[PDB]
Structure formats: structure tokens, C-alpha cells
Amino acid sequence: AHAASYLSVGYFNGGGDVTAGPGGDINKLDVTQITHLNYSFGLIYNDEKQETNPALKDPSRLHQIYLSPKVMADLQLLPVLRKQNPELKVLLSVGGWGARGFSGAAATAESRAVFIRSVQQVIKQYHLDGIDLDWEYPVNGAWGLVESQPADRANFTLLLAELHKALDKGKLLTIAVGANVKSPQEWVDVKGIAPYLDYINLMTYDMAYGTQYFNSNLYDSKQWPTVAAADRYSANFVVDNYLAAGLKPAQLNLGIGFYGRVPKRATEPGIDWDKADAAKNPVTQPYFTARETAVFKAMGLDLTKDSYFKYNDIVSKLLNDPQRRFTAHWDSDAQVPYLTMKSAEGKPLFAISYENPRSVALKADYIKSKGLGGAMFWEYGADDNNRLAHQLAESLGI
Numbered sequence: 001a002h003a004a005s006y007l008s009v010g011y012f013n014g015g016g017d018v019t020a021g022p023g024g025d026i027n028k029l030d031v032t033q034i035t036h037l038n039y040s041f042g043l044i045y046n047d048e049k050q051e052t053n054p055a056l057k058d059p060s061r062l063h064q065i066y067l068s069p070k071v072m073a074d075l076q077l078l079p080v081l082r083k084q085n086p087e088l089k090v091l092l093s094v095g096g097w098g099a100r101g102f103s104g105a106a107a108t109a110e111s112r113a114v115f116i117r118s119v120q121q122v123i124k125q126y127h128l129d130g131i132d133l134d135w136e137y138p139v140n141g142a143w144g145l146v147e148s149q150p151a152d153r154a155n156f157t158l159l160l161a162e163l164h165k166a167l168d169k170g171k172l173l174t175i176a177v178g179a180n181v182k183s184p185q186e187w188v189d190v191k192g193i194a195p196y197l198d199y200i201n202l203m204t205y206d207m208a209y210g211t212q213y214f215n216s217n218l219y220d221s222k223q224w225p226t227v228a229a230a231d232r233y234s235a236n237f238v239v240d241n242y243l244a245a246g247l248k249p250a251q252l253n254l255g256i257g258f259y260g261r262v263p264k265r266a267t268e269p270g271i272d273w274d275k276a277d278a279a280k281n282p283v284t285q286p287y288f289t290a291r292e293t294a295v296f297k298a299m300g301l302d303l304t305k306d307s308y309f310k311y312n313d314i315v316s317k318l319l320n321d322p323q324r325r326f327t328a329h330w331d332s333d334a335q336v337p338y339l340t341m342k343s344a345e346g347k348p349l350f351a352i353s354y355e356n357p358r359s360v361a362l363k364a365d366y367i368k369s370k371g372l373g374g375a376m377f378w379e380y381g382a383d384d385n386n387r388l389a390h391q392l393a394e395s396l397g398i
């Protein structure tokens with residue numbers, strides 16, 4: 001008798017991000033194409049000894065949220081964005097890759113209460129519709145990138161319960177969660193936290209690591225297979241792993257990457273840790289030479305440091321490379337595009353996978369058939385004239 005109604009939740013890197021670099025121009029976003037904007041990022045004042053941002057080390061503000069000058073300035077624009085789209089909801093996302101402070105903020109009644117008061121204060125001062133927590137990651141700490149402890153799982157749940165209690169009726173509380181199968185298994189009590197959250201944003205991307213070629217494939221590739229089992233990921237695999245853990249699909253948004261990654265397999269040996277003497281018997285080897293790495297370096301991507309390539313830069317620099325060095329392809333099983341570059345020997349070398357309008361629309365179709373609540377994407381500043389967001393809006397009937 002009636003139609004479904006899907007979210008499209010766009011993260012926007014306004015303040016700067018560890019992996020994605022300096023913040024974008026908020027004025028370039030077409031906010032009519034999204035249901036929700038997660039302005040990223042608020043950071044957390046913290047006492048982690050390895051924190052290298054001196055502002056966050058201010059002990060008088062421990063456990064509070066820090067908003068940089070750009071963040072403050074960008075948030076002053078919300079009245080203009082809301083006139084542009086009076087349906088739009090705007091949240092602040094706190095955290096992000098490499099962001100410290102969650103483990104300590106979560107750790108005691110007193111720390112949780114300071115954090116929650118700071119969340120309430122920020123919501124009221126900037127008139128936000130809610131808060132998104134992007135803790136990467138409870139328990140695991142992204143393998144030591146931020147502080148962590150096993151009490152993180154239970155503490156997160158408590159933080160979220162207390163936060164849900166404190167938040168005005170009508171305000172949104174959401175989180176982003178990782179792709180890794182240990183996230184729902186071990187790091188985050190997804191069933192326990194489900195009742196406190198309006199929706200959950202699945203980071204179904206950043207898969208182009210270890211022995212895997214694709215960054216955000218929907219299903220596994222067969223033409224370009226991942227070799228080590230522990231690296232074998234797809235957006236669908238991740239979704240299924242969260243579903244097995246007891247979440248209802250309508251509470252989930254499928255995260256979509258408006259970017260690509262050069263897989264680490266191109267430049268670093270791929271280790272299968274289930275093998276005998278794993279570090280000396282890599283199961284994949286690097287297929288880029290100085291010739292391929294120099295091309296990326298010349299484009300401002302230093303592959304010894306980062307593999308991140310914005311969609312708009314994929315378009316302008318790779319697809320539209322004047323020297324025609326990159327050839328576009330479609331992986332039929334993974335349901336995403338990828339590029340190859342020609343080796344000196346004449347062989348296609350897998351350079352990068354990403355998302356284009358076709359693949360975004362296929363992920364939308366998957367959202368509709370799997371019965372997910374919507375899409376989320378990282379991140380709006382990387383779109384090309386708002387085309388991928390527009391696609392999503394069209395495909396989801398936003």
C-alpha cells in the first residue's frame with residue numbers, strides 16, 4: 001500500500017581528519033541531497049600521553065569536546081543550510097580515525113558526566129539535532145592508535161545509556177562502527193546499545209588493506225580475489241556480521257565511500273597470519289615499482305604514508321589524466337569500479353577501487369533489498385559536484 005523511506009547521512013570533513021587531510025568548504029555542499037549531515041569532527045580534550053595536539057591536552061577541559069575555530073565558524077552557517085533544506089537534520093560527529101579521549105571519557109561516572117554535559121552544551125550553543133560518536137575503536141583502540149582497555153565495551157554502553165537519558169527528547173544519538181568482525185563480536189555490545197541509538201552508521205569501506213584489492217566492494221571479487229582469510233571483506237559480509245550479532249537491518253545505514261584507496265597490496269607484502277612462519281612467507285607481493293609510485297607521488301599521494309584518494313580527485317586526476325595512464329573497469333562480482341595502470345611490461349596493474357554513480361546506485365538497491373534503514377557516506381567534501389550524493393538521493397527516493 002505504501003513506499004519505504006530511507007536515510008542518506010552525509011559525513012562532511014569540515015575540521016580536518018587524520019587520514020583525509022584538511023577540511024573542506026562547507027559552502028560547496030548541496031544539502032538538499034541528504035537527510036542528515038554529520039559535521040566532522042568535534043575532538044575530545046584528553047590526558048592520553050601520546051596526544052600530539054596541544055589544545056586537547058588542556059587539563060581544565062579534560063573529557064570535554066573541543067571545537068576548532070573552523071568548526072565553530074562552519075557551525076555558524078547552519079541557519080543558511082537549514083533554509084536551503086528545512087528537512088535537513090544536522091549532527092556533530094565527535095571522534096574519527098585517530099581521535100583520542102573516548103576511553104578515558106567513558107571510564108568513570110564522573111568522566112562520563114563531564115563529557116555528556118559538554119555534548120549538551122555544544123548541542124544548545126550550536127543548535128544541533130544530535131550527536132554522532134565515532135570511536136575508533138572501543139577495546140581495540142585501532143591497534144594502539146588511541147588508548148583503549150577491555151572495560152571500553154561496557155563503558156561505551158554505559159556512556160550511550162547515560163547520554164540517551166540526558167539528551168532532550170527528539171535529539172538524535174548515533175554512532176559509527178567498524179568493518180572488522182571483532183567490532184560486533186568483541187569491541188562493541190551492539191545488542192546492548194541498540195535501544196539508545198536512532199541509527200547505526202556502518203563503516204563498510206577501508207577494506208583495501210593486506211591482501212585485499214578492493215576498498216568498498218559490495219560482494220567479494222573473484223577476478224581480483226583477496227588471498228588471506230582475515231583480510232577477506234565486503235560490505236555485505238560486514239552487514240551480515242552485524243545482523244548475526246542481533247541488530248535489525250532497519251536500524252543500520254550502509255556506509256558508502258566517496259573515495260578510493262590504492263591497496264596496500266600494490267606496495268607492501270601481504271601476510272597471511274594463519275600461515276607457518278607468516279612474516280617470511282608473504283602470500284602476496286608488491287606489484288608497483290618506483291614507476292607506479294612516482295605517478296601517485298606526483299599527484300600528491302605518498303603511498304608510503306597514505307592510500308586515500310578523494311572521488312573528485314579520482315575523476316579529475318586519474319580518470320581524466322591527460323597522459324591517459326589509467327583505464328577504468330567494472331568488477332561484476334564486487335559491483336564497483338576500479339582502475340588499472342599499465343606496467344612497463346604492458347600488463348594492467350590494479351591501482352584503485354572506488355565508487356561511481358553506478359556502484360552507489362547498486363548499493364542503494366542493496367539497501368532496499370536487504371531492508372537497511374538508509375545510506376551513510378564518507379564524505380561530502382570528496383564528492384564531484386554533489387553527483388554521488390545526488391545519485392544516492394535519486395536511488396533511495398529521498
Ligand SMILES: CC(=O)N[C@@H]1[C@@H](O)[C@H](O)[C@@H](CO)O[C@H]1O
Pocket residue numbers: 142143145206207209210231
Ligand atoms: C594500522 C591501523 O592503526 N589501523 C588499521 C589496520 O590495523 C586494520 O587491520 C585495517 C583493516 O584491515 O585497517 C587500518 O585502517
